[PDB]
Subunit: 349 residues, 4 copies
């Protein structure tokens, strides 16, 4: 959805004065045809009759004016009401796939002028926004909340399964018994979880102010998921991979590519044919995930540790003395690494 | 519910153009009587007057036409609108249990012609679909979402209890202190959980496109439950049982038979009279569940392991050398089996 | 709420044909005044004019008849429609606190005849049922579902807190460091949880068929809570207490008495003044809870074990030989008791 | 929101007879203009015509009277209905930002008389309450329940994350490996959780009787959170801090100040510049949290223990003999402290 169009959508999103007025118009079953222009004098060819108002905008004024037949003309920033009860006359030759005089008029005028035109039928509760060659149907909050609440509840389920796969993989990592199947399975669920987030995003935006709690819920649920997926990619990719490259891997599986077993294993650098082979491939974590998230060791410094010990397994066997031989690790970071790992092994395994 | 009827239901399920039109008809309180035929010329005996249109179908056209009294005649694939404002005259002698001219007309015409007839009253919000001798009442999405959301919330509860019973049984299995009561109790909850899924299924289908999130939620919640139940049956049945036979046991308790303690113990091969005897019967897991789900050993190969060690208890005491004496188990699978079991015992017990 | 009245409520609960008709009447904004009698000939003094029908009842017939002014007279079992469009004339001297002719008429007639009278106003969506001197207002399903869904969600919260208190008490029990405060705190939450269940019960009943999922949810959530509370009472009461007596203690705190710290400690047999003293009183579990729920030892036999070992602490130190000296405990039950306890200590502590 | 205004809001909150009447007025689309005064005789200058009633108030009476045009005059405590169908004539010169005769009249009269004036338009479902220079818009229960249910669901998410941070910090505390980052992160989530509670509070109040379940849910979810945050502040502040001072720290971050890392660390007494330095600062718990919440040692006595051992780490190494050297700790409290700590270390680490 183009950004130039997303900007216009904000104009009638829950929270704005304009939307408050449109909600009331809908509740009263009045119809509405609103034309947003900047220079009223320049549309004497498409705007006919009505009353010249040139007054300050307000939700109550718009509502009251919508009681009359015809269209209302507002300024682009919704600060002035220019005309009311006007007859809009766009070029009849302009193609339109709309039905009815009001919507056909709205699409034609928007295409002809490159301006925003809002239409509301008397019987229905949707707001149709036309801008240039675009058409966006805005829904009432109740419909949006139902979809968003369902999506969140769905996300909770995926997240619960992600957490179980993660704790299981954690045990396998600490014991160095991880297979490519385990890794890919965890990444797959992580990619599916973030995809759901991406798909509900437009619903959230459209909710405007009414989407505050929904946003907070999405944040609490998916907080550090992205980072976690990036660290897993770095820890299990066939060959050393830069963080940015890992983040790009993530972005691709979250939008373009499809998170299938073989496909994920393929992008990780493993030449696998059948998904049954995944259980056959053994892999050892580099150690980034634990070093950063648990030992609180910056990636730039974690590279150094991996460069020397190569795997988490070796890192877990290294003494403080051993660890201090690494650039960037003093008695403090050496203790943190050593202690955080020995603590997890004892508690988890 | 016959499949030939489920096909017709899809025609007016959320997502289709036809349903979009019917939703609008309902919202406007217009009534509707739609007849779906393939060869319009062949019904001159039941179709009278009106206007011959023979035009391409669209939701807006259907809606506009429903403003007139009478019936609308569409093509079976909903691509053409043949007539509008017609008088439908089915045989008056045909039996009908419907009330009112419109619904009695619809049921008679559907029975007389073997075709689909859709009726909508002006005052109510349900869609009545008649086909041959069938009648299916389709509900609005809001009603369906309420029932489905409740069922899912209910499933979450059953699943939480299933998970607790499973972790408890896991401890008992690793310690070899399982009784027939423990097994049957876990299977019972598992059968009750899947039954709920089966009962909400028609609601999900009827939701059409609006049932996407609901489906994803059901999948995340019951993902590997079926497999798990089949493996339990294989591990605790009185005598060795094939997977297919286990899957058939599952299908029966999920639809036909009732998951009562004694009944489940009976089908497992145990001659028990009172449910109080279940706590008295000791049983030892064959080992399939752990071998497949944890060691990732294919059932065909797990049979071999069980054939030799007979029980999970013995399998847990076998060394890698011991395990490698089995056909299909090399140093890799022997390690996986041995390590995965010793890890669970240490962590869980 | 009297049972004789609960019986009449069932007549118009979701699921019945009568309620289906009333729902439609409400949806159409028609009013309704229904009189349920067994012998129509015997009310010529309160029933005037209208049409004598004496026909079989059906939802559609009732609905159609409600289009006329006046009242409808049905048979008590809702199988016949006796009159329609009648004028009901109860004694004007009978006291009534209702407003409007229809509701004042309904209450007077119900009091005068001891029969059921149902009233529905044209503008509102509630069903008012009058029977003798009772009046019950039945609500639409949507209102009931909202309250019930909220209550269940609330129960989930109390249950989560109950579970945390229980696992904490479990640790304390296995270690024999329980104080009267710990016990009372757990019982209090358990009494509050079951009370909520008792308060939502009428809402559930009133939901009729539409309350199936709600019931299943309440069952899964509070399944073995009652038993658990009874066993705790038996394990921590100051002096040995019979099961029935424990169940009566439970029933009282779930309805009559208020679950306050001191009050619960008082009824347990402990003479405590301030709630601050609770942390000062040390108590040792008899062992019933663990013996029955974990070792699967019947209470009649558990009494024997307690009679000899006195406390769970001693029971946990007893060998199989020691345990077998008890009446009712053989090598099987001795092993179960010994093994189940040693397993919990190892896993939990 | 001023308390003098909150008092007036209660007058029309769900549960009151007045609100029951207003809900009905709204459902019937009747309008309403209600004036609440104590001495009717004293407003002959703003009250004109209508009917003098001087009768007892009831919901049905108010409803019936609202069918007439004009205003209704009630007594301040809602016990009497003084006038009906009156013309209200407040001073036209008084400033008003309202639209329409009814709302402009209501705001003017409330400002002019310092009394409560309630306005309801025929088309909308909100109740507008005017009092002196205040204006409060009351919403229907369905709107409030949706917001409250969302907020609670959001709180559940924050609480789940708080619990995970707490268990993680618990491990770090028992092992004495806590950094200022860990502490601040936990406090931040705790401050964000309580803030949400504070923001939903007005919605809860406005729900009146319909907010009972909502309140119970908020209580179960945030039960001992405040105490826990206060104890953390006491355990990790740079210098010894009194409980009251800790509670004041809490109140500030829950309303005035913003819970940002550096800001929280700053108020704790640590001179930190960048949030990256937090991971660099090591801190040791005083021991209050564990002493009070786990050992059940009063803060007044816990001060003594800390005064001597200084840190939880030292407290965990102290023998019963060592602990008994402290004022206020006998064999009982010494055992509780020693045993509760050794139990946590064994179970958690
Ligand atoms: N060129 C044409 N071709 C065929 N029929 C025509 C027509 N012009 C007017 N009508 C018929 O008259 C109806 C009502 O016209 P009206 O101006 O009151 O009431 C109108 C008007 O207030 C507004 N509206 C529609 N087009 C407009 C425009 N170009 N400019 C300003 N307002 C418009 O929307 C209302 C409803 O529109 P709707 O089509 O549902 O309803 C239309 C339509 O059935
Ligand atoms: N054979 C008969 N016996 C008794 N009464 C008769 C009748 N034929 C017509 N009516 C009376 O006239 C009403 C309205 O007829 P209408 O054609 O406008 O309005 C009709 C019509 O547009 C449509 N409809 C019903 N039957 C139809 C049919 N066989 N073919 C096409 N349209 C039909 O449904 C609308 C409402 O039907 P509804 O029964 O509620 O309402 C009926 C009914 O009360
Ligand atoms: N004794 C009386 N005193 C004062 N006013 C009187 C009255 N009798 C009749 N009315 C006035 O006439 C209105 C409509 O009478 P209606 O019979 O059409 O329409 C009635 C009638 O169909 C039904 N209904 C009420 N009482 C009934 C009864 N005793 N028997 C059968 N039907 C009754 O409920 C409808 C609405 O009742 P509602 O009171 O709202 O509306 C009443 C009321 O304002
Ligand atoms: N001074 C004035 N300036 C301009 N127009 C005037 C006016 N006085 C009356 N009207 C016009 O008459 C309409 C209806 O008057 P009404 O008394 O029936 O019906 C009224 C009345 O029952 C009530 N209401 C409004 N102001 C009131 C007041 N000061 N005292 C008592 N009742 C009032 O609210 C109803 C609707 O008010 P609404 O303004 O929507 O509708 C008003 C308005 O369009």
């Amino acid at each position: 959805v183009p950004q130039e169009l997303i900007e216009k959508i904000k104009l009638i999103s829950p929270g704005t004065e304009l939307r408050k007025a449109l909600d009331d118009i809908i509740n009263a079953n009045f119809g509405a045809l609103i034309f947003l222009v900047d220079d009223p004098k320049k549309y004497e060819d498409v705007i006919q009759g009505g009353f010249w108002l040139d007054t300050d905008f307000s939700a109550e004024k718009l509502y009251e004016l919508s009681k009359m037949d015809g269209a209302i003309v507002l300024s682009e920033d919704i600060t002035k009401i220019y005309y009311a009860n006007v007859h809009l006359v766009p070029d009849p030759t302009i193609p339109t796939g709309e039905t009815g005089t009001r919507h056909r008029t709205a699409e034609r005028l928007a295409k002809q002028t490159g301006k925003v035109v809002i239409a509301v039928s008397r019987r229905r509760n949707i707001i149709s926004l036309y801008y240039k060659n675009y058409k966006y149907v805005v829904n009432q909050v109740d419909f949006l909340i139902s979809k968003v609440t369902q999506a969140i509840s769905t996300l909770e389920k995926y997240k619960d399964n992600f957490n179980k796969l993660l704790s299981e993989l954690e045990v396998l990592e600490l014991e160095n018994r991880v297979t490519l199947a385990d890794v890919v399975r965890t990444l797959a669920k992580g990619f599916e979880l973030l995809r759901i987030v991406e798909e509900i995003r437009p619903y959230i935006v459209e909710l405007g102010e009414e989407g505050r709690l929904a946003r907070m819920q999405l944040r609490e649920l998916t907080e550090d998921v992205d980072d976690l997926l990036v660290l897993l990619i770095m820890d299990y990719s066939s060959e050393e991979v830069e963080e940015e490259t890992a983040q790009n891997i993530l972005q691709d599986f979250i939008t373009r590519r499809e998170p299938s077993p073989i496909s994920i294993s393929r992008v990780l650098g493993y030449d696998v044919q059948q998904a049954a082979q995944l259980d056959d491939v053994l892999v050892s974590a580099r150690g980034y995930r634990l070093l950063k998230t648990v030992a609180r060791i910056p990636l730039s410094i974690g590279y150094n540790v991996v460069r020397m010990f190569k795997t988490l397994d070796q890192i877990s066997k290294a003494s403080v003395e051993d660890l201090k031989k690494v650039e960037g690790i003093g008695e403090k970071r050496a203790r943190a690494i050593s202690e955080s790992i020995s603590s997890l092994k004892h508690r988890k395994t």
